[PDB]
Amino acid sequence: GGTILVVTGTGTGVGKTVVCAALASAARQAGIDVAVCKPVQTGTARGDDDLAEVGRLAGVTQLAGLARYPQPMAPAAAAEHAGMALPARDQIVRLIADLDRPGRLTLVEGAGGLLVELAEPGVTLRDVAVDVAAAALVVVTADLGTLNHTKLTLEALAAQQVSCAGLVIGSWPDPPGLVAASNRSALARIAMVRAALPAGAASLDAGDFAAMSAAAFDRNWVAGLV
Amino acid sequence: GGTILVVTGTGTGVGKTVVCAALASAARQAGIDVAVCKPVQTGTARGDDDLAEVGRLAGVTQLAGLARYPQPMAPAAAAEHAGMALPARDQIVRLIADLDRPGRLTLVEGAGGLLVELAEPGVTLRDVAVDVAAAALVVVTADLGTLNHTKLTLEALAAQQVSCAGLVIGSWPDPPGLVAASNRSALARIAMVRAALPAGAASLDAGDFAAMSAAAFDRNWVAGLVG
Ligand SMILES: Nc1ccn([C@H]2C[C@H](O)[C@@H](COP(=O)(O)OP(=O)(O)O)O2)c(=O)n1
Ligand SMILES: Nc1ccn([C@H]2C[C@H](O)[C@@H](COP(=O)(O)OP(=O)(O)O)O2)c(=O)n1
Ligand SMILES: [Mg+2]
Numbered sequence: 176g177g178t179i180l181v182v183t184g185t186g187t188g189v190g191k192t193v194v195c196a197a198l199a200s201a202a203r204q205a206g207i208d209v210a211v212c213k214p215v216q217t218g219t220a221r222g223d224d225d226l227a228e229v230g231r232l233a234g235v236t237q238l239a240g241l242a243r244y245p246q247p248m249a250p251a252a253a254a255e256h257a258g259m260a261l262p263a264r265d266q267i268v269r270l271i272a273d274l275d276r277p278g279r280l281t282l283v284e285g286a287g288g289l290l291v292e293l294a295e296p297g298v299t300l301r302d303v304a305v306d307v308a309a310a311a312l313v314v315v316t317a318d319l320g321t322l323n324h325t326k327l328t329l330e331a332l333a334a335q336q337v338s339c340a341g342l343v344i345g346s347w348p349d350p351p352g353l354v355a356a357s358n359r360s361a362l363a364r365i366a367m368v369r370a371a372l373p374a375g376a377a378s379l380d381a382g383d384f385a386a387m388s389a390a391a392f393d394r395n396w397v398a399g400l401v
Numbered sequence: 402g403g404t405i406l407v408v409t410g411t412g413t414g415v416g417k418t419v420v421c422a423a424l425a426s427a428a429r430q431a432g433i434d435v436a437v438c439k440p441v442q443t444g445t446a447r448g449d450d451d452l453a454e455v456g457r458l459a460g461v462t463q464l465a466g467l468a469r470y471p472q473p474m475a476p477a478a479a480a481e482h483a484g485m486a487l488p489a490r491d492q493i494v495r496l497i498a499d500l501d502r503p504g505r506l507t508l509v510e511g512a513g514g515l516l517v518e519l520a521e522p523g524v525t526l527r528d529v530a531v532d533v534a535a536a537a538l539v540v541v542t543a544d545l546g547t548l549n550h551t552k553l554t555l556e557a558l559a560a561q562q563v564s565c566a567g568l569v570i571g572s573w574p575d576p577p578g579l580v581a582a583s584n585r586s587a588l589a590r591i592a593m594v595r596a597a598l599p600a601g602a603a604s605l606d607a608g609d610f611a612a613m614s615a616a617a618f619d620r621n622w623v624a625g626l627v628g
Contacts, residue, residue, distance in 0.1 A: 187546040249545060252583040288549025290556075320413045322475055323514025327553040330516075330560065357478040 177279040178400050179271065179309040180340055181300055183289045185324035190345020191314045192225040193377050195282050196232035197370065198312070198343075198397070200388035203234060205398045208279040210237035214267045214303075215286050215293055218247035225284060228377070232384045239274055241266055251292040261295045268306040275307070280400055283309065289328050301335055310340040312369070315362060317344050317355040325362060341396075344371035369396065403434075403505035404627040405497060405535035406566055407526055411550035413513040416571025417540045418451040419602055421508050422458035424538070424569075426614035427623050428506045429459065436500040438465040440493045440529075441512040441519050443479040446471035451510055458603065458610050467496045477518045490520040494532045501533070506627050509535065515554050527561050536564040538595070540571045541588065543581035551591060567622075570597035595622060 182198075184191040199209045211229045226238040241262045244253035254261050275281050285293055285300035289311075293300055304311055311332050315325050325342065332339055342362055348355055362368055370391040376384060408424075410417045425435040437455045452464040468488045470479035480487050500507045511526040512519060515537070519525055530537055537558050541551050551568065558565050568588055574581055588594055596617040605613060 186549065246579075248580055248583060249548060252580070252587075255583075256579075287546055288553070290549045290552040319473075319475070320514060322518075323516045324412070324550070324553075326516040327514075327550075327557055330557055331553055334556065334560070353472075354474060354478075357474060357481075361475070361478070 176275045177277050177281065179275050179281045179283065179307050180312050181283045181285065181304045181309050182312045182314060183285055183300055183328065184314040184345065185288065185316065185321065185328050187287045189314050189316050190372060191284055192228050193372055194312070194314045194343045194345055195284050196229045196384070197372055197376070197388040197391055199229055199233035199235050199282060200385050201392045201397050202280050202400065204385065204389050205394070207398070207400070209233070209235050209282065210239065210274045210279060211235050211282045211284065212239045212271050212274055213284045214241045214262060214270065215250045216240055216243045217250060217253045217286060218245070219243045220245035221247060223247065232377070232379070232381060233388070234381065237274065239270060241270060249291050250286050261292065264294045264298045264302065267294050267303055271303070271307050278401070289331055301331060301337060304337045305335050310338040312340045313342050313366070314345040315342050317347060317358045317371070319354050321358055322361055326365060329366065339366055341367040341369040343369050346374045347371040348374050369393070402501045403503050403507060405501055405507045405509065405533050406538050406626070407509045407511060407530045407535050408538045408540065409511045409515045409526055409554070410540040410571065411514070411542065411547065411554055415540050415542055416598060417510050418454050419458070419598060420538070420540050420569045420571055421510050422455040422461070422610070423596070423598055423602065423614040423617055425455060425461050425508060426459040426611045427618045428626065429461070430611065430615055431620065431624050433623070433627060434502070434505040435461055436463040436465065436505055436507045437461050437510065438496055438500055438507065439510050440466070440488065440496050441468045441476045442466055443470045443476055443512065444473035445469050447473055449473060459614070460607060463500065465496055465500055467492060475517060476512050487519065487521050490524045490528065490532070493520060493529050497529070497533050504627060515557055527557060527563055530563045531561055536566040538566045538569060540569045543570050543573060543577070543584045545580055545584070547584050548587055548591070551588060555592065565592055567593040567595040569595050572600045573597035574600050595619070
């Protein structure tokens with residue numbers, strides 16, 4: 176097998192999808208084959224489609240998913256609203272393992288946070304990471320509260336021996352502001368800050384997004400994910 | 402001793418201070434002597450003063466602070482900005498142990514989340530709760546993301562054997578939207594939900610706030626918090 180990473184966030188709207196696209200785009204420019212899997216997608220009625228973002232922004236074509244619910248709620252609530260069940264644990268783990276292959280970087284994007292229910296009954300992206308022996312990239316904010324949330328997610332990961340592959344500041348404000356700059360320094364004291372992605376990068380076209388992504392990550396670290 | 406409760410939250414601005422005032426008010430109405438302490442206060446140069454607000458809202462007079470920093474940042478960054486030190490771990494425990502007394506409910510409000518650094522090195526409100534053998538009342542939102550934050554916070558508490566006293570939904574909207582309602586039912590399955598304080602409770606006057614506090618909690622739970 177190759178390399179599998181779960182891309183998780185300290186919360187909702189922290190930039191997980193932009194970070195999947197940014198790391199995919201950088202790995203692709205490093206000559207690395209990339210797949211992104213998003214097992215469960217919500218908010219389809221208003222048009223949320225995270226795989227399509229990665230496709231447009233990064234150019235990934237191996238884009239794999241299992242379920243789509245209309246309501247903009249957490250998976251289990253959106254499923255109950257529609258009157259249908261979440262996918263099974265086995266579907267998710269086997270899908271990801273089939274995507275995985277030597278030389279390929281496989282990114283798994285969950286929904287919202289580390290401990291939200293992804294599959295019936297009560298299986299989370301942490302459970303999925305355990306099952307596929309994946310490491311975890313943690314997307315954080317740079318705003319007030321992020322040190323607590325980061326440390327909480329990092330403890331949850333270690334408790335199930337899910338290795339932390341680093342942090343990414345999903346959105347970096349312009350201009351920074353005194354909270355953000357202080358938090359960037361403090362985040363780097365509790366784990367590796369792999370990138371801070373400029374605010375608004377999701378509006379970029381494919382070429383500008385590729386340029387941004389190539390600069391946003393250290394060259395050696397990406398190539399070494401393998 | 403009496404009963405010590407640390408009041409912590411899933412994030413900043415979730416209503417820890419309103420909850421302290423509200424639980425204090427309900428305990429006071431039950432005849433229970435209440436003390437509220439705030440070991441680390443930041444933002445004082447914009448008027449941030451949680452003890453003073455608990456006093457305004459619930460009439461609590463036994464209020465105890467220790468560290469105060471001007472800038473509205475995490476305690477560690479607010480100290481650095483002012484050229485001051487964080488308190489030592491034993492200074493926080495002394496502040497709480499001096500208030501602890503039989504028949505008294507002593508509330509300890511944290512500083513913006515359970516693992517925020519309160520003392521050096523990396524000492525948190527969770528360590529303090531271990532030191533004073535307090536349980537933790539966890540204040541949460543009803544908006545999306547609360548289930549993840551709540552479970553991460555509850556796992557962190559169990560990891561150091563700090564008992565969870567239950568959940569308080571800090572701000573409860575009227576009317577409740579679909580997500581709030583779904584989160585509330587799901588939070589109830591994660592731990593006991595002790596209260597869901599109506600949004601905008603900070604604008605109630607002393608009478609209305611105290612009536613809201615009486616209704617907000619189960620009297621049997623309040624009265625059972627301390628003999
Ligand atoms: N560097 C960034 C990060 C997020 N954004 C935008 C993109 C979206 O509109 C919001 C939230 O980002 P995103 O959809 O990736 O958040 P989650 O996948 O839910 O974690 O912020 C951006 O434009 N530039
Ligand atoms: N049930 C509630 C909860 C919060 N508020 C107001 C009061 C404040 O202006 C903000 C934040 O609440 P609070 O100061 O207690 O938040 P934290 O102590 O930082 O957790 O919301 C309210 O009016 N009614
Ligand atoms: Mg407060």
